[PDB]
Write a protein that binds this ligand. Sequence first.
Ligand SMILES: *[C@@H](CS(C)(=O)=O)[C@H](Cc1ccc(CN)cc1)NC(=O)[C@@H](NC(=O)[C@H](CC(C)C)NC(=O)[C@@H](Cc1ccccc1)N=[N+]=[N-])[C@@H](C)O
Ligand SMILES: [Cl-]
Ligand SMILES: [Mg+2]
Ligand SMILES: [Mg+2]
Ligand SMILES: [Mg+2]
Lengths: 241, 204, 125, 219, 196, 244, 243, 240, 195
Amino acid sequence: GYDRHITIFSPEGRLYQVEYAFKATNQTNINSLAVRGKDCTVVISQKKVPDKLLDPTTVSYIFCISRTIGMVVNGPIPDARNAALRAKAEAAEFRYKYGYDMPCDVLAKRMANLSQIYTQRAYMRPLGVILTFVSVDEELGPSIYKTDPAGYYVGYKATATGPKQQEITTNLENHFKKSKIDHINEESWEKVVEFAITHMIDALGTEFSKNDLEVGVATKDKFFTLSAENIEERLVAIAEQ
Amino acid sequence: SDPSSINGGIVVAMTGKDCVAIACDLRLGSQSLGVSNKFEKIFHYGHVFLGITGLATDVTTLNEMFRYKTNLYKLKEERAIEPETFTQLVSSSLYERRFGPYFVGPVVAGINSKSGKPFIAGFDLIGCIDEAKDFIVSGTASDQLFGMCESLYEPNLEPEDLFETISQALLNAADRDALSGWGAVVYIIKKDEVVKRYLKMRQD
Amino acid sequence: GYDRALSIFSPDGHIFQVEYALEAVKRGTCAVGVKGKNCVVLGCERRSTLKLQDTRITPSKVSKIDSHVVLSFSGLNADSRILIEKARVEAQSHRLTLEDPVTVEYLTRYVAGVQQRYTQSGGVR
Amino acid sequence: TTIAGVVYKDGIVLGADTRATEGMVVADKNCSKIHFISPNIYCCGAGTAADTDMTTQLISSNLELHSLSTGRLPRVVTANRMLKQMLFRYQGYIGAALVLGGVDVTGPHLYSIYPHGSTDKLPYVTMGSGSLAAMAVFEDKFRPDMEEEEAKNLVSEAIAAGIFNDLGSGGNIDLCVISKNKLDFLRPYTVPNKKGTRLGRYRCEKGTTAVLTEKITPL
Amino acid sequence: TSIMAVTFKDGVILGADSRTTTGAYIANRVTDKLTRVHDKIWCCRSGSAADTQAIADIVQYHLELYTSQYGTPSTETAASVFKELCYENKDNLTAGIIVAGYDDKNKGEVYTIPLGGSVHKLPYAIAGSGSTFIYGYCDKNFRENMSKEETVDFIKHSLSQAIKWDGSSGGVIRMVVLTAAGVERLIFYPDEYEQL
Amino acid sequence: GSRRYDSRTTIFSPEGRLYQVEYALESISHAGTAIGIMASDGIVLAAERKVTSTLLEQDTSTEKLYKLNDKIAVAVAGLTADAEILINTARIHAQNYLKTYNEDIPVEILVRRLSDIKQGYTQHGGLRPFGVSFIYAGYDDRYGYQLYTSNPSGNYTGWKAISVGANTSAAQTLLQMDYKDDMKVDDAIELALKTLSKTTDSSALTYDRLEFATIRKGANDGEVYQKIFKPQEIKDILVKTGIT
Amino acid sequence: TGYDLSNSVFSPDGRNFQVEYAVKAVENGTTSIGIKCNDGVVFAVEKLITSKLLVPQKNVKIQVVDRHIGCVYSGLIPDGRHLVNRGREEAASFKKLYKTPIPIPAFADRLGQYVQAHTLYNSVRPFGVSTIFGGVDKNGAHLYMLEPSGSYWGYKGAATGKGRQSAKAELEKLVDHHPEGLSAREAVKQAAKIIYLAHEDNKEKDFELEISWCSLSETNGLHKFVKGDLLQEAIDFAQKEIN
Amino acid sequence: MTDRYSFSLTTFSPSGKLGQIDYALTAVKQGVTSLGIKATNGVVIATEKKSSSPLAMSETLSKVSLLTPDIGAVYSGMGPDYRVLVDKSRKVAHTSYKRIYGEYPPTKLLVSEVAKIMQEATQSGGVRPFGVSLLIAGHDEFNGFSLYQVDPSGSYFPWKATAIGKGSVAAKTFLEKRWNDELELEDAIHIALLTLKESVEGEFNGDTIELAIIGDENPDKGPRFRKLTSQEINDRLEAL
Amino acid sequence: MDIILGIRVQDSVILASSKAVTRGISVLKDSDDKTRQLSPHTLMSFAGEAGDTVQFAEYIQANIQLYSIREDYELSPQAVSSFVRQELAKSIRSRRPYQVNVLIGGYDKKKNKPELYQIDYLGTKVELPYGAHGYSGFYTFSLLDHHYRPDMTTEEGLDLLKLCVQELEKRMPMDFKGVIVKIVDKDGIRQVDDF
Ligand SMILES: *[C@@H](CS(C)(=O)=O)[C@H](Cc1ccc(CN)cc1)NC(=O)[C@@H](NC(=O)[C@H](CC(C)C)NC(=O)[C@@H](Cc1ccccc1)N=[N+]=[N-])[C@@H](C)O
Ligand SMILES: [Cl-]
Ligand SMILES: [Mg+2]
Ligand SMILES: [Mg+2]
Ligand SMILES: [Mg+2]
């Protein structure tokens, strides 16, 4: 049964190492969510600091890839950082060669094509991560693109990733069935973040403090993460209505 | 010293009404010394004709190279190469030696078998395409040929009118060049017959 | 490159890939060599399982290495062509550098040295 | 060669003559010097003709593959970078001197690219042996945000200056007008010189040339 | 070319002419020789246009990739990357680059990188063919901790003279102001600066 | 490390056989039968296509008979994709020889070259062999008309008539029975088709299940012509010989 | 089964068992710790005295990288040295290009990516060390801990090796009882105590204490070893606290 | 890091089977149905857009890809494997063909080049075969309209009409009845939409179906490849 | 090396090649054979730069002899010349080119025809009735233009060759110490020992 140790076909036409890399994805026990506004793309993710000895400021699964592109990772941190460094390098090389900022989807496809190689070549293992890229693209507008260990990628109106992804997905599905639009019809990103947090609270059934969340926001010409106090202000506004 | 004028010689090609003509001299020399009077400079790969002037070792090498390439082309495509396609192949092949080029002046001539359209083309030694309808000239008496062609040529000539035009253009140009002559060949090419004629000319 | 050690020692001090190569020779059609007082004769078997053969063009069992030396063999035919080519090249290389054709002992020693090399090189049988 | 380009209100107007020379001799009186890069980007070419041709084709080919992968129209900056970085790498030995003009998502852009790998981004440029003649016309009459038919006339007038005053330049005037709504490839835009009329017929009558032998083969 | 970078109280200002010549022909009279490698790290370029453009693009790439990983680079770091390229490829380059940038910690900083590939940190720097004519003027008139208006006038007067005497220099005087407040682009036309 | 997963494609069995060669031959035994018959005035290549649907476009299809140059053709039995790799290599070797010597490559020299490539995959590199057996039909001015075969071992042999692929045992007996040395092309055409008609695993032999070719010097002015038969022509020769 | 025989193989869980086996080698090693203080960091390690024949103070375990970073590790000592050699190459190439000495987070990812790379292929073995490291950069003090998987985080305090649970408990008390922070000289004393308390897990053989520190005030932001009087003062403080 | 897998991962088993190719074909079988039909004046290729989530924008995932202006491709099997084949097919059409001959490759030769890439994954060191079967439709001046299938082995066959993946056995039978040599392109599109309805479970409309044609030139030439819009499919579903 | 001539008559090819080997001021040898037998019915004479000449000739000889053994067959003179030309044409764009000019005189046993190929160091091949390399041709070609006929016997070829060598001995400045003459016909290669 060496067809389960390396990336070759099993008799069913399956790649077990790819499937087991997908299972490594949930090893962190963190749920992420991404939604689109009019002018923005918001990504939120659970933050868990179990050890009191940890410096909580260094515990992060959101990455600033370029100025325009943000990336949240669902999976172990070593593979996350592997993917983060490569995406940063790819985005920088792109800008140098082609003279304009790498689009979100172009990066996603590039990282997906790399992930595909690990599913076909035997010496390389897949990375045990799902990469959700976010930006406000200058051509396509607010953008969410996701990559996985299979090398699959696709654009999203909104998405969710993690152990409780199905609950979050259906919660979001039901909202967009009502509104009948592909986005959160809201001017300010502040309110789109408030939406994202609110719909995660409803879906997961848990309340959040400022230190339980991690937020990333893409606008035109910059992606940035919120501080604990910026999130606290966001949580105050949710509670007050 | 100048590789393009060690061996000498010329090629000219013309279009006519439903026909093309390509012609060359027969000389090969080592500068002043005449060596061969049987050195033909026109070759063919199916129905596409290629004249090559310049350094004779490269003339021979390129002929052998385009035979090679057009043979593989035919095996893979299951059809003979067309003049338009071959012209692009010559250009590619010359430019891939951009910084160590073949010292040659190629000339394509032929009729597109599907459209019936008469086609000629010329190149510099690194593969820039001269894509002219009227006429293409090459070799050590290229200036002479340009002058002959510009005054003698007119469009839509019948095959045997065109023969007299290209032949007189070649012969009179060659006789004003020390390194050209020693005989000549003219191909008259129609959609499904080719007439090859050797010309009588002064042997000095 | 493919480096894998295929010819290796076993606990009883045998190199099985070399010994199994001898079994391939055992399978091959019989070849015989007899030297007289002023000649050598090379006899070779041709198996008659194969009729409808064209004997003009079928690879002959005896091969000339030079104008004065011949090589016959038993075993894998495809493998024999590789030894014959190498030997023929070395025969001409010897003439070129020594200005004298190979001795039969020298040519043998070369072919034998190629065969040996393939028993302790990685990636080859 | 006289190649030029201007940025006008709605987009880009490129211009070029049609004379291909080999030393002092004119090999082609109507050759194309305005090359296709992508559907929204064109390139006028001067310098070494083969280098000009093959450099544009290669970057056009690579941009086509880039544009298929990204699914969006290519930009002028990426055409500019790819040409620039290649020409720089070859330290001037690829003698391509380009006027690159096109229209992006970000608007109209015009570049001059030099053999050594330098590029200037400009509202108007001229290159080739007739650049000074053409540049005189632009310094005389250019203004920013021109209307289309005005810009067409200015470029045409600038190429003409090159045609007549520069010996390296001649033949017809080709234009290429590029805006968001259209691409107009005008070949020829103008024929400023009539072909010289010949007074005699010097073509020989049949049987005049002396033949030794003949062979006919059918196909 | 006439280029300079001058530190002052609130930060640093870069200045340059706009003329690019091919022999005696002015190929480009509206050249932008002040090029951005980071938000508040810019450079003045002199020498081969192809070389300085190629370098500046590579530096921009390195600092973009630095920023992705380690946050905003110092002006010193930018100068070190310029230096590394210029020094290690000295045999194949003709680049005289002034690097100027604004940190909040370090405030305004100016680094000059002449032909050799050496680095020199200075209060102000002048470079390009036209700089020879203003060594005297600049040394006599420069003071440390000038105001923004004084530094704009110091650069304007200096490059005015560089332009007046150097044929290789001319056209408009472009400037780029780097302070805590942000990035301001200034332009000064011949009719303004020639009458100084 | 990686050693764990290595099949070791280039080793002897205890009996002195090459495992992968033997197993590739087993693969080839299931492929559609191909027959070559050499006459005094030409060579016949006949081959049976496999699986076939009514929806397969036959006139633009080529799985069995390939052209190496104007003098030499091959009939394939085994993996078509593997054959095409080798075919393009052979096509190049012929043109390299033509370029070097200004003469068309002799048939045996081309055959040896390909066979030597196949051999290399059995002795080094750790890769699987090519699951292909060729029948080479060719002409040159030394030996005239020649038939050869090669197989995954890299061994090649010359033949007057031969089969490869499926039912070779049965096919070779039938050929050995009816072949004669003075035979002509038109007779060999008939023998080839009759042999396939009896050894086929299909219910009947039809034009849509066959590829067919002849190498004749039978041309004007003693020059060799390769004829790859069109679907309609295979149908006509099936009626002529009386099989349909 | 067989998923644990080869490095870089995902088990059906989604785990890399070879990495988890490397962790066992780490858990087998001696106790090492790191303490983040007000303006710097302190590192300390338990060195088991196998025999009287060991020369005191000579077999040094804590290693310096560049001039401002300290590294200490538990597990296979040669693997730790190999990682520090690489760290020194990374810190050198960073300073060569960017002039400034490598920041601690930047340096942490350099080690992190390299250790992670040794979990990507079956042709290499994972590192048999957890590495505690840090120092002072332009943004202040930073303490890190890096595991065989390539995982690392920032820490207030860190501990690894056989006595890690004992140590971790002691570090957690310091974090609770000093929210305003700990001084550099205090952290040296506390480091000595914690190694002495964590020595109960390796109590058969006696040991030798080794401490190092970077502090903006006490060492000018450079890595130095605690020697002589300051070392003896820390040993005395530690000996007093166990009694 | 040494790529130590210099040896084949696809080898002959005692029965003469190449295991990994067969297993790749099993992966293709599990994949969603796609088909191709050739008319007299065109070719049509079609497949179901099997959306992994309703939150996913299935417009961004293109199963039907343009390879050249006159050649299009569709697949059944593993999407990521298809994507990298399309990348390589597009590139090889430029490097080994357009940059040499100044024109795009004919359908059969581009197919042959893709087949070669797939064969090499079936014999080279340290790789598995591609887990896709391709259906390549195209036009060129001298061969006219053509439709090819390419399998994980590298083997390729020309078709009048065919289908691959999930419901291919049933679909091929459906096409055998309906196909003739006098079909117009509109008739073929009609038959494609009928055939594809059988294998689709859920929603059947322009948003859940991807369908492209190789036909007339759309205004040097215009491109013959055209991807039908969501609206253009729905119009033909009313006349169904 | 200096003078190498060739003449193709009715039924044979005759190669004449000088005996002198001169380095600088001194004639080192007066009996040097500037030829190699490539195959039984194909002979190659050569002249050019010292060292390169023999090295090239022997290298070609080795390759043709290898072909002969491998195929048990003699290549045609046409094939041998095309091989040699390609080797020289490859050489000319090398780091250090072979400075060697050759004549290949062969008898094609298939066609029953003598054949003479002249190839220079650039790879410039021509089939001729008579040929020469270097300055020899300047004197000799005019004689051969006058006196040659395609139907000449081998003895008539040798007489015409004597007239060529006499003219070279009269008008050339260098003493080339006479010529070694070799005849290539249907029966193989033989040396005329008195000339
Ligand atoms: C005008 C350029 S200039 C001197 O700056 O005014 C034209 C531009 C141009 C651009 C594209 C095309 C067609 N694609 C044609 C013209 N340039 C030239 O005319 C150059 N001429 C050539 O390059 C000619 C081309 C032949 C086909 C007439 N080639 C030669 O002159 C040399 C080639 C060569 C070039 C460089 C190095 C070595 C050789 N000849 N030959 N043979 C301009 C160079 O004249
Ligand atoms: Cl990619
Ligand atoms: Mg793998
Ligand atoms: Mg003359
Ligand atoms: Mg001035």
